Amino acid sequence: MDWVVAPISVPENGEGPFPQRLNQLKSNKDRDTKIFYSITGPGADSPPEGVFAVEKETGWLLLNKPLDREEIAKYELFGHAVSENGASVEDPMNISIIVTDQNDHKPKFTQDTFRGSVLEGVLPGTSVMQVTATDEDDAIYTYNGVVAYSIHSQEPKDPHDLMFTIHRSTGTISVISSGLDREKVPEYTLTIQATDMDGDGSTTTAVAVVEILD
């Protein structure tokens, strides 16, 4: 052809229909004799078996089911070409398959509860703590794995509500009001959120507990 194929990029979670054609393998010895094609490697003849196949007669490389980037992100397979008289007519061909991302993981907070303390007299603008959520999707080329933080809600609501903020990118929680008074309200429970696609995607929650120190 030459007996080569460029790396193939396949987005995960393809709709099909399956089996899906990716590339047609072909040995120029098929002018001379009938060629039988086959494939080996993890994803073909070793676990996960049968994700990919090749059609014996035609050389079509097929994907049999949708892929999942977070299970396996890249496959390295080998294609074979054998004459009808049983002789290999090519050295095995390196077939590289790269699985590209879709946004299919929700963020996950690293803790169900995060705790931080401040002195009663801290001024507005004071950083209390930094929370974190991870996201298994790509955050280099897209926002699939990019988390935006927000505050869902605060209890109690004394001396008033929305006394805290969270930095949309860093997860740093700050107090933005005056009026902390430990003798009145010694602790606040914040329900916090993390949302992928930098705020447009899906959202998980955790708790941040703010202790007013004595």
Place this chain on the structure above:
Amino acid sequence: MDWVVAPISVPENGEGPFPQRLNQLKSNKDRDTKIFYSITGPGADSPPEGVFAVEKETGWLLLNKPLDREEIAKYELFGHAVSENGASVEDPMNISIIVTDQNDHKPKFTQDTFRGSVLEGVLPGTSVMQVTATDEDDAIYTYNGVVAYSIHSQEPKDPHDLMFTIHRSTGTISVISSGLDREKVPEYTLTIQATDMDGDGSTTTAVAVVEILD
């Protein structure tokens, strides 16, 4: 995003419509201020100017016309992000565009006429000469640039016709008949052909003149 884009592969001779969107550039400083996008490089702001553009407000990278791999096979552009107050908010982003092939060149013989001579007594199977045609299209991953040779016709047709063959891949012309006789027919003119897609594509012609030596 990060302020990066993976290389973009675009087949030549795209149907459009144009302008065609390729990728949306985006700086995360647009949470903070309005961003104006722009592009530089050969193919954008230097020859060939205006092949690619970027939409100021949206950051969409556009292709303005179909590409031709044999004119330019790869572009290296730079994307820019500038705040409404005039400050650059990113270092320029490397944008790599790779133009991939379609079969749009016919083969071209290297000579309009090729000449070879043989002794009258050469046996069937004798190689007379080797002709060549080139093809500017890809011959690594496809047959776009892969030439199949054939004989179009022979004059004169004495002592009979189809006295010669040509090797489909090498362009080696051979005599396959007995009966060469210089005193009867001292020279044969062969119209020869070269066809891309290894025989399925389009076809050019040349002349091969076979001299029977004394």
